[PDB]
Amino acid sequence: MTRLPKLAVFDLDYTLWPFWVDTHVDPPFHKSSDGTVRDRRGQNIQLYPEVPEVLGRLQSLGVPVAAASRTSEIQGANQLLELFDLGKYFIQREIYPGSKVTHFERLHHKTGVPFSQMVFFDDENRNIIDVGRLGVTCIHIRDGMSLQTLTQGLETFAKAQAGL
Numbered sequence: 001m002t003r004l005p006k007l008a009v010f011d012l013d014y015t016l017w018p019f020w021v022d023t024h025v026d027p028p029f030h031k032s033s034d035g036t037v038r039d040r041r042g043q044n045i046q047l048y049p050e051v052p053e054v055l056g057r058l059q060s061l062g063v064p065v066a067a068a069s070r071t072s073e074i075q076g077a078n079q080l081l082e083l084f085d086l087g088k089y090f091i092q093r094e095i096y097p098g099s100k101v102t103h104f105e106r107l108h109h110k111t112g113v114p115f116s117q118m119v120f121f122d123d124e125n126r127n128i129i130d131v132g133r134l135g136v137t138c139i140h141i142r143d144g145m146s147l148q149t150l151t152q153g154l155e156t157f158a159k160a161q162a163g164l
């Protein structure tokens with residue numbers, strides 16, 4: 001057996017997209033005539049390349065997905081998920097300021113999944129620290145999410161659940 005997590009949780013800024021939604025862009029956003037997503041200042045908004053397949057892959061492996069962001073730009077973060085047609089991949093979204101221990105406690109309540117069976121991807125060590133205290137397997141990422149990072153992450157979770 002290779003233990004698959006019962007819930008995968010993703011940070012947003014520098015995890016699914018290369019910027020801070022409360023700093024580098026100016027919400028609201030909208031799809032342009034050329035199919036791109038744009039903000040009030042005409043910026044081309046893009047996700048990390050492989051994000052759609054990362055989320056689709058989890059869906060294929062039967063792993064439920066949730067979002068956990070501390071951004072104050074709540075409606076902006078939510079709109080990007082919609083515009084990028086990623087809504088279909090998430091079962092829950094915890095997007096609001098605060099230590100992510102809160103986001104995870106609520107995810108635990110809504111999903112019934114034990115913290116030990118969750119895998120979490122985030123680029124900030126402070127979030128890795130806070131959430132790791134709950135027993136969640138935390139994957140500290142760099143250069144955003146990609147299929148390779150997903151694979152290594154699930155591998156790390158499987159190894160943890162195997163006494164490694």
Ligand SMILES: [Mg+2]
Binds near residue numbers: 122
């Ligand atoms: Mg981040």
